[PDB]
Each structure stands twice: as C-alpha cells, then as structure tokens.
Subunit: 430 residues, 4 copies
C-alpha cells in the first residue's frame, strides 16, 4: 500500500512496549498460543486485515498472530478507541498499523482501506470487531471477497449483523462468531465492562458513584456487568429492557426495571449498554437532572441522540477531551461523555488485559481454524468447538492459581462423560 503505517506519535513506542511487556504477562491465553504455535506457525501464508480497537491488549494479539507466521495490517474500529503508545510500539515493530486516537470519519475509513492490500497480495483473512471491515469489503470491494478465507467477528453488534447478512444470503465468506463463545461473552462483556465502565466514567468526569441513581438501558452481559459495577459502589441502579426474560433476571437481582420515559427523570448517571437506536432522546434530556452524566458503552454510537443536544442546548462547553458539558434551555446541565461513542475505551483504557486474553485467545483460534481447516467452514457464521472454548478458560486458570478437579474413571463413567471431554452440552448456558 502507501506509507508503512501512520500513528499519533512513534516516540510513544518505547513506552508502549513497556505496557505491552506488562500486558503480556497478564494474558496467559495469547502467550499460551505463542509457545505451542510459534514454531508450528499455523498462520503462515495468511494475510490478516484487522479492524479492532488499537489498544495494548490488541497489540499482544497482533504480535501473537505474527508469531504464528501471519502477515498483519491493522486499524482501530473506533475513532477514539486507539491507544497511541500501543499503536506506536506496533508500528515501530514493523507491523503496518494505521490507527490513532481521535480520527475523523474520513481518516477512519482511509485507515481501514489501508489494510486491504499486502506485499504479496490482498487480504486473505479478516479479523473484524463491529463488522465495519467485513461490511466495507462486501459492499465496496467485492472483487477481494473470493480471496478471503474467513472472517473473525468479535463483538455482539457485528456478529448480529453477520447473521443478518446470511439471512439475506449477503454473507459471501465463512465467518466464525467469536463474541458468542462462553469464555468470550460471559467473561469479556460481563466482567470486562464491570471494571472498564466505571473507569471511563471516572477518568472522564471523576464523579462519585455512591448515593447516585444510575440508569442502565439494556440487561445483556454488558448491561449486567455495568449494573453490578455501579450497584457495587453504592449507586441505585435502575434497568430498562425490552426482553421479559432479561427483565426478570434484573428484577430477581433487586434492580428496578422501568422505561427510560420514566427513569430519565430520576437518573443521575445514564449508561446505554444497548445496541439499538433512540435509547436516550431529547424527550429524556429535557427531563434529566442538572449535571446528569450521560454516556454509551454499546459498540456503535446509535443509542444517545447527541445531535439533539447540539441542536437544542443553550450552550455547549468542553471540559476536556471527550467531555462536554451542555446547558439546556431549562437551566439544567448535561455532561456528555466521549461524544456518545464507547465510554470505557473512549475515556479510559478499555477492558483489562487478563479478560482480553480470553476473547483474544478465541480470536487466535478462530483464525487458525478458518485458515487451517477452511473446508470445514462453509459460508456462514460458526461457533468454536466447546472443547476449544474449554481450552481458553483452562488457559487462564493457572495464573489465578486455581486448582481444578479431575474426574475419576468411576465418576466419568457415572456422569457418562470423558474425564476431559466437553463437560457441558452445547445448549448449556453456563
């Protein structure tokens, strides 16, 4: 392609490598895939074009993929999710990375297109996060379609769209749904957001959660992780939902479940963990308490109506990067975070490295699968063998010094399951 890469500051690499150094020791999964595959190099010959937030954790993923003999050209899947010191260490490392914190819609797309063509040919693999890359290609670069051996979607929103495509026979290349791995969804979205949400908020506003009424729209794994977090600091969490089953779980957990039409008048902190549009409108903004902290954590920023804020506020003042304090015609203030984009990543460092090793291990596996055994994955979104899913968890058990139990021949017989073989039926919801 063009320039070898492009980032905010390459002089940040020296620092980023330190972050990467510390990060590596916290991601047993990726480092594990390295020891057993560094030599084998199952990814040899592969040209992976990724679109995942360019953070330090992702840096370890990229360096792992390369260790497996892959050829990588990266880009961030969010205009604010990029970590400039992490990206600097990667570029300085020779990996063509085109990502920097605070890009423009235009620069963002350029960065993505920058990863399509390699030295010895175009991308033959895709590691997407949000579907932006797989979508760009399917609708703008069809010519390259027939050459991509596979897709790797990591987020719910993207995987959601992955199915949509198939639903219309649009999907033209076999995909593996990584986000929906037990070790992925139940650990990353849930446990990660629990720790990364409050971070985005605090680093941004530095507000005290205790004694505040926080409103969470959506009760999925992210909504569950977020709620738990605020609730654990002393905030009264109110939940809004459209799914009766997800609504009951919340109620059963002691959370009040209402409509944003009602909650907007009580909330002090508004978090949208939904992947839907029109979650927080002006009809709610005009109802929010003075200095209400509004932010979104759902992948795409389509939940909060920021345009309204910008088109109906009496005044807009920027506190600091990704922190704007509007003044409504009613005299009430509204603190909008990260311009409505992902809050943990846009205002903080995102999920911690240990939990990202889970998702990323699934990512390294998904890639080896699609590349190594293509004929095993027809055009359509697939899941990773539970035996593999089990391999991910088992990989981080040691760092935590967990001592797992081993079934005896008699017990395994009793339960009618392999001492090591998958211990749960597919339908099992862990």
């Amino acid at each position: 392609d063009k320039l070898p890469y492009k980032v905010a500051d390459i002089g940040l690499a020296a620092w980023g490598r330190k972050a990467l150094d510390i990060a590596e020791n916290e991601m047993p999964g990726l480092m594990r895939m390295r020891e057993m595959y560094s030599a084998s190099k199952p990814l040899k010959g592969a040209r992976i074009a990724g679109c995942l937030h360019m953070t330090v954790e992702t840096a370890v993923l990229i360096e792992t993929l390369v260790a497996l003999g892959a050829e990588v050209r990266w880009s961030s899947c969010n205009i604010f999710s990029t970590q400039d010191h992490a990206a600097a260490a990667i570029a300085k490392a020779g990996i063509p990375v085109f990502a920097w914190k605070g890009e423009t819609d235009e620069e963002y797309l350029w960065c993505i297109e920058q990863t399509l063509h390699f030295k010895d040919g175009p991308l033959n693999m895709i590691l997407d996060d949000g579907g932006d890359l797989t979508n760009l290609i399917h609708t703008k670069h069809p010519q390259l379609l027939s050459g991509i051996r596979g897709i790797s979607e990591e987020t719910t929103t993207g995987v959601h769209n992955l199915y949509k495509m198939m639903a219309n026979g649009i999907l033209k290349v076999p995909a593996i749904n990584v986000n929906d791995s037990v070790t992925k969804s139940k650990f990353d979205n849930l446990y990660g957001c629990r720790e990364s949400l409050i971070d985005g908020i605090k680093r941004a506003t530095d507000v005290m959660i205790a004694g505040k009424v926080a409103v969470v729209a959506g009760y999925g794994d992210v909504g569950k992780g977020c709620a738990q977090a605020l609730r654990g600091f002393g905030a009264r969490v109110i939940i809004t939902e459209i799914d009766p089953i997800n609504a009951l779980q919340a109620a059963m957990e002691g959370y009040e479940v209402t409509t944003m039409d009602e909650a907007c008048k009580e909330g002090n902190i508004f978090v949208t963990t939904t992947g839907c549009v029109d979650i927080i409108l002006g009809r709610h903004f005009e109802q929010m308490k003075d200095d209400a902290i509004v932010c979104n954590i759902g992948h795409f920023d389509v939940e909060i109506d920021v345009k309204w804020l910008n088109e109906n506020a009496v005044e807009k003042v920027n506190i600091k990067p990704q922190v704007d304090r509007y003044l409504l015609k009613n005299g009430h203030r509204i603190i909008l975070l990260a311009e409505g984009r992902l809050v943990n990543l846009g205002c903080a460092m995102g999920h911690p490295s240990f939990v990202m090793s889970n998702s990323f291990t699934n990512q390294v596996m998904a890639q080896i699968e699609l590349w190594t055994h293509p004929d095993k994955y027809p055009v359509g979104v697939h899941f990773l063998p539970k035996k593999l899913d089990e391999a991910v968890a088992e990989a981080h058990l040691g760092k935590l010094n967990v001592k797992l139990t081993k079934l005896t021949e008699k017990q395994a017989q009793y339960l009618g399951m392999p001492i090591n073989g998958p211990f749960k039926p597919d339908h099992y919801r862990y």
Copy 2:
C-alpha cells in the same frame, strides 16, 4: 387403582389449602395459564402421571393441570420432599396423590406405581422430575410405553438421563426438556437454591453462616445460587469444579477454586451441588473440622458417602428429624443433614412459590405442547420455543411491577427483529 390416595394426615388439608391459597397469589405464571385455558381445557382427555416433590407449589401445578381438563395422579419424587399439609389439601380435593414425608424405598416405588393406572385407562402422559417415573416405565412397564404421548422432565439430573437414553435409542417416547428453559434453569436452580439452601441448613442446624468457611462442590446454576447465598451472609465460600469454564467464572467472582481433597480440611459447611458420585468421602470426613455441617442439594443423593459415616463413626446420635450428629474416631463431630438427600426440600420447604411459577409454567406448557401438537414432537428430547420461554418471564413481570420497554417500528427495523418476536438468538445464554 387401589386406595383413592394415601398421605400422612388428611386433617392437614384445611391448613394446606391456606398455604395453597397464599401460594397461588404468588405464582402469576400458573394462575395465568389458568385464566386463558380454564375454559379451553387443552389438556382435556389427558391422563398425566406425575413424579415431582409433593409441595404446596406443586399443588398449584396439579390444580392447574386439572383446571386445564387433565386427569392427574401424583406422587413425590423424593422420600422426604413431600409436604404433608399440601398433599392433604390435594387428596381431600379428590386428586389421587400418594405421597407423604418420610417414605421408605419400598413405599416410594409403591407410590409411583400407584399413578400408572387411571379410571378410563393407563397414563397417557408423564410429568417427571428426576426421570424416576420415565425410567420405571421404560424398564418395567414397556407395555404402557406406546400409549404415553409425551414426557416432561423438570430437573437437570433427569434431563441428563433423558439424553443418555436417546444416546442409546432407549428413549421410546418424545420428551420435552423443561429444566433447560431460560426461565427455568437461570431462575429456579439459581435464584431458588440461593434462597432455599440456607433455609434447609438453618431450619436443620440453625447455624450462623457469618464467619464460616463454606465449601461448595460444583459451580452450576445451583452451585452458583448456593455460593452467592452463603457468601452474602458472611461465609467464605470455596468452590471445587471439574469444568474449567465454570471454574473460571468462580475465580472471576472472587471464589477460591480447589479440590475437595484440600477444602475438606478448611470447610465448616459442605454443600454438594454436583450431580455426580463420590464428592464427599470418608477420606474427607476423616479430615473435617469438629461439628462440620455436611449436606447435599443435588437431586439424587449420590454425592456424599453417608454409609462410610454410618460404618466408620464411633457413635451416631440423631438431633431431630433429618439431623444426625456423628462422632468420628478422631473425636471430631459431623452433622449430616437430611441423610444426604436434597437439603432445601428435606429440611426446609424448598424453593419459594414465586420462582416455582416459572418452572411450573414451563411444565404446563410442555404438557399442552406434547398433548396438543404431538406430531410436532418426534421421539427425542426437545426444548420449548423461545417465544414461549419469553411468555413465562413476561408473566411474572407484572407481579414485580416491572415496566418493560416496547421497541418502536424504527428500532425493531434497526435491530431487525419483531417488536415482540423472540429478542434473542437461540444460542443466547442470557
């Protein structure tokens, strides 16, 4: 058959009806099935033979099936799980129930056989809990097999066996796996045991949980619900597991995961939420602290080796029904509860009525499905349409005064899902 029924005391009906009365107002699911089907009577012509713990909640289930025009002959699936006042109110009601608290292995089977034959013919339906009924029939009364239109397994253990039969083409009649409904598993096993576990313990030993090291074997929904409970009262919960994924969840929740071989020496309270044999042996008993409270909550009592206690204790003293205090040769005491059988049901009243309405609503539905649309269920275990699973949750939302959100035409479009249509993919693990 023989006698109209048989119970501990029919003079307990007057009281049991009061229990049923209060119970009904707490089970919106069953009462809901009642209003829309009381007249329709979709179960008309059905002769359901049940094997589910005979409790007050189950009483509402029986009185619901009958309201649906079904013909019912019940029995308890546990020699200690029976609620004598509940069973009295049922028999006095005219429903042939053969269950009483404290049956013998002999009297237990007799009770089951008592439900096979009806006035106008043998059983044409099965509502089992544990597989005991479906197993008795398959291996002892094959003749009646071909007449049964379907099975309804309610517990993991049972459903586990349901699949085992199919695995060997033994299952000879279409079954519906109710235990594995989102509203069933994630609410009953998890939220029920959370509240019913400590109950069994307290009513039995009346011990203080706070400051005690409790050991929980198995981290399934029951293990999860139990752990959370003890943990919430001030006990240090230690978990043992064979599944790395379930072990990671525990660790990620702040629980120490080890082997019973290790934990036995530290635990003060032992709870087996596993469905496997040889969980607590004498090798551990000989290692337990003085006055260690050991109990099991897994359906079948196959986890704790009580025989060893009875064959190796220096002395056995019975504190009160279902509470025995053993004296080991090492001088240490061991308080065994409910003789190893289910603790919440054997020493307490079981799960509360509100949560049982979820499981039981699934049961009423499973029955209407198999009976009504039989040709839709070939020999093999099946799940209940997610639309239905949603119907269960949605039915208890109101009691909790939950205000669910309604997708707009635009949002539904965005999300690409019906405003009411199932909101989650099948693979969704809620």
Copy 3:
C-alpha cells in the same frame, strides 16, 4: 416462691439438652467464661433475676451464670420469644424458669414476678432485656431496690429507657449498658438480624424475597442488618429514616430513602427496625399491595398499628401460629406476622448461637463487674472497659480459626500503644 418453675412441656427437655449441647460448642465466649470461672465462682452469693427471651442460647447463659456460682430464676422478656424445649431443659435442670411460648400479658407479668424472690432472700441482681424487669421493680417493688447490686440491660430499647430514668433521677441502682458494647451492637443487632430476620419471615410466610420490593423503617444496626439481608436475596430494599446521618449511609449504600407515606404504596415486605410508635398505620395499610407481608423486629411491638387491622379489616383469617391474613375493604390482603411482636424470635429461632455468645459473654462480664466490683459502679448506666470488649471478640476468633497479628515492640512504640492494650480510642466507632 411458688411452683419450682412452669413451662410448656418438660418432656421437651431431652431434646432441648441436645440443642443446648450443640449450642454450647458454638458459643466460645460463654464456654470460655466457664473454664476460667467455673472454679473461681465470682458470682457466688449472687441471686440473678433475669428477663431475657428464653431460648437455647439464653439457656447456655443461665447454665454459665450458674457455673459461676450464681443463683438464677429466669423468665422470658417476650410472650412469644420463648423456646419450649430450651426452657424445659433448664427447668428439668433445676433452674427455676417460668417461661413458655405464647403467654398472656397477665401470665407474662406473673412469670416476671416469679423471679423476684429466692430461697435465701430476694433478688440481689438483675439481668434484663427490654427493661421490663428493672421497670417493674422500680415502679412496683421499690422495697427490693436497695438490695439489688446492679442491672444488666441487653437491648437498645431497654438501655434507651435506662438513660431516661437517670435523666429523671429515677434509676436507683447502678446499671451496665451491655447493648452498646462494640462486640454487642455491631455484631448482635447487625449480624444476627441479618440472618434471623429472613428466617422469621420465611418460617412464617415462606415467601420468596427475590424480585420483591422490601421496605425497612430505620437504618440502625438492626435496620442495616435487615436491609443487607433482603437486598442480598434480590429484593429491592427501600429505607425510611429520621436521622440524616443514618439516611446518608443508606443512600451511600445504594438504598432509596423515603417516607413510609410514599413507600407503603410500593413495598411488598414491610419490616420495622425502629423502636418508635406509629411507624406503619392504617393510612399505609390502606395503601399496601395485595398480600403485603408486614412484620416488626424492634423489641417492643409499638411500631405497627395492628388494632387498626383488627378494627378495619373486612375479615381476619389465621394461616398458622403467628401468621394472620387480613382482608381489607379495598380487596387487598395483608399478611401480619407474629401479631406485630419480634419477628425473628416470634416466628423463628432468633439470632444464631455464635453471635449470641458475643452479647452473652458481655452479659456474664457485666454481672461479674457489678457483683464483684460494686463500689466501682455508682448509680447510673455504665459501659464495659474496652479491654473487656476486646476480650469478647478475641474469644470467638479461634472458632473462626482467625489468625490475628501481634504488634512488635517497634510497631507498638511507633503507634504508641500496648502490644495488647486497647487498640482503639474510646470514641472509636469500629
């Protein structure tokens, strides 16, 4: 006096002794006071007249005081708090105990009077709980006043009145405020109620706490322990308070703080942990949801207006002992528990033995102080030396296998405190 004792059933002693036997091993404090004072008998010559709920734990207190050479004549401080098997074991043991579950206001007083006179003289000591005994004497038997060496109040309500008397120079004998010992208040009222509250509720109504909105009046240690309990089972706890400091704590803990005038319309479970009158009136009852569970845990039953229920209900039906289901003219039902009296003791077994060993150890010490060193306690309510309060905690650490840290000569120097000497200033609120 008259009859040696009087109880519900002496043939319940054989059982009670088993309860006592198990209870003893769980109360390291009392058993500890036993080993070092069994021979010394510092209470020798004392004639203690107690008025504390006659439970198994209290049984260990009585048998301990006696082991200390004391002469005891007991009675319960509540018409429902008595444990008949416990009381039987005591009577059968020779200790004049006049208490049985379900006394009448008349029989209750008779029982108290029955403890004033001993073989070798009238009572020379008082071990009260609620102030009922110390009040009766001060206002009805002044003649015996001058003979009593001291008082031992165990509950907040009582101690509250103890000061009230002094405030009016009414208190005529030195009292020791046991309820306000760090090991007493922060562990008994808080940790005991946390476990004993739900018990009284469950054993009585057997209702599911999860998903229910529970309302708690008062945020003292009892309110704190109760709230935490319900909240931990999945109930949405709402708190009402008059103290801004106790209200802030709640808010800071994520609890909604409102007025009963508002909460009554939302609560599903009403618990009064206040010690004040007119907490739950008919103005609220007329506003409660159908089948609302109302109960009180505050010592005296002066918070809930039951007369109103009995005078305004359309009908009153008794479910079982201490459980009445009223029917309001509006069609809604109200489940009143234990007739408004203490719920954990009236409907359950009360606090567990382990936590009761704390309060009771303080009680044994209070008695030894007043008796042994009288001249050290002038007329007026006093506290127990912190060194002693520390002795109590220290006594139960072992059972929990806690390994405390020992200050070094250098550290003790640094901190400027005795390696063992009281580690906290008097004003310290632990």
Copy 4:
C-alpha cells in the same frame, strides 16, 4: 512572604476552574456554608495556614474559607497529592498556594513554611492534614504558637498524633478532631477509599481486579472501604489485623484474616490501610508472586519497606510516573506504586468531590468554631457538636434527593428526643 505563590503551571488554571466549577456543584456542604456565611464572614480577621492535599475539592474548601472572609495561604500535605490544574486555578485566583505534584522533601517543607506569614501578621489559625503543619510549628516555630487560635486535623494519623502531644502536655493550642466526626470517618475514609482505591491502582497499573487475591492490611474504615471495593470486582480479599474486634468484623463479613507472613505468599495485590510501620517487608517481598502489585493508602508512607526493594532488587525499571517494576533475585517482579506514598492521591485524583464535601464541611465548621468561640475550646483536642455533625449529613441529603422522615410530637415524646435535636447518644457508633 516570598513569591505570591509557586506551582507547576499557571496555564493550567483555565482548566482547573472548569474542574472547580463542576466540583462545586457536587459539594452541597461547602456551597451550603457559602450561602449562609458569605455575607456573615464569620472567619473575617482569620489567617488560616493550610496543609491539605492540593486537589480540586480542597480548592473549593479554600475558596469557601475565603468566602467566609478568611485569609488563606495553602500547601499540599503530600509531595504527590497535588493537582496542578487545581492549584493553578487557586493561585491565578490570588490565593497564595505553594504546591505542585512531585515535590522534594526539601521543596515540600519550603512550601509549608511559606504559609506561616501573612500580610497583616503570621498565621492565627491552622488547617492541617497529617499533623505536619502543627508539628513543624510546635517544634520549630514555637514563637508563633501563642498566636494561633486553633488547629483543625483532618486525618486519623494526624489526630492520632494530636492526642499523643496532649498525652505529654506538648499540644500548646486547642485542636478540633475533624477526622473523627460521624460524617467524616464513616463517609470519607470508608466510602471515599472504596471508590478512590481502585482508581489509583487502575490508573497506575490498569490491572484487572477480578479473579485476583488482594491482601489488605488493617480493617479500619479505610481497610473496610478498600476491601469492599476489591471484593466487589471479583477479587479474593484477605485481611490482616492486630485488633480482635476489627478482625471479627472482617471474619463476620466473609474475609479471611491472617498474618502478612502468610498472606504475602498468596496475594496478587497488596494494600496497606494501616498507619503503622513495617507492614510489608523484604521478608514478604521475597515471598510475593511474580508481578505482585504493592501499594499503600495510609497517610504517611511508613508501612511498605521500599528501601529494601531498592537495595535488594536485581533491577529497577520505571513504567511511568509513580509506577516502578522491580526484579527480585528470585526472578519475580514487583510493581511498586506511587513509591509507597498514598495510592489514591498519588496515582489517581483522590476521593470524589461529593464525599469530600462532608469532611470539608466539618472543616469549615471546625474553623468557625475555634475562631468564633475560642474560649469554648481550651488547649486539647475536641469533637464537633453532634448537632453539627448532623448538619453536615443533612446538607448532602438533598442532592441525593433523599426524603428524610419527620418525627411527630407523639413520637418525639415516646422516644423522648427533640423532633430535630440530636437523634443519637454521643457513644453511638452509627
């Protein structure tokens, strides 16, 4: 004195004012003291010399004291606790502030001395945090002693020393113990550290708390707040203590209490909330797991032996400001945070503004008390009238939209307390 002030960058004021602007709206206590005293100016004629961390919250305190007509000259009581943008906004405002993040022991003292002399005379008041100021004066500038109307200690460690002085007749000026106000200790130390602890850790190491064994030395309010925090994120918290009562509370809360001599081999995160020396030594360092995160939160950095790390490490590498990664001779790594100094303030922004309003309100009051009614405070440390302590809490209730309850004439009579008068006896431990 010398220069008008001295800070890191005055070009940081513009931003700091925004921080102050948002902060003010979150501190109802201070802003409340402003409205009712802005005109009155009770502090008129006062020359307050402060030694408290120079943060945004403290900035609102300074601007409040001034609004009260006081004359202030500030300085930070920690070489790393200073917030440069906050200090900038203050200096730019005209208030002589001599503080900047990252001072030297020499520069630190210089800054303190800079606050002793004012335009119209030397300091006549003292607002200390840690006792550093009141100690410098007492031992180095005795001459100015006789002119100081009072002292205001804000932290436990400080107040601890305040008493020590008095214990030896060293304290030569009346002090008010602010740290020990109900609204101070139980809210700041507990609720603040809960939120500010994890911040310092995360912003420094960005580590995932979930699944990690965190070790907390000391179970005071700070230990309590810290433990709860980690515990709530999924980390297994182990506690070490010297006080049996504080140890029992922990045990009663489900925490394992042991010796650091034992925990050092299991902990993944070490937090010292103690105020004592020799808490974490090399004997423990040599026993810590690889990449063990060690940090202190106790006022003075005397708990962790960093010297040992610097004198026995094989290599020391600085990750970033206040983050150093040592390499032990055993191959294990140790991540030392903030060079052992306060972690929440040295690596994060400290306690949130809302909780700081409580402590600071008490500070504004302590100042008005000592200054206004001096003769009411003889030489010695005093507490703030509970009625006042109540005023603080009541001031923040509104922001939280808390609806307090009002005692009626009948209830206040029954309870025997003023409808508004202090609702708790002095000994009350809230």
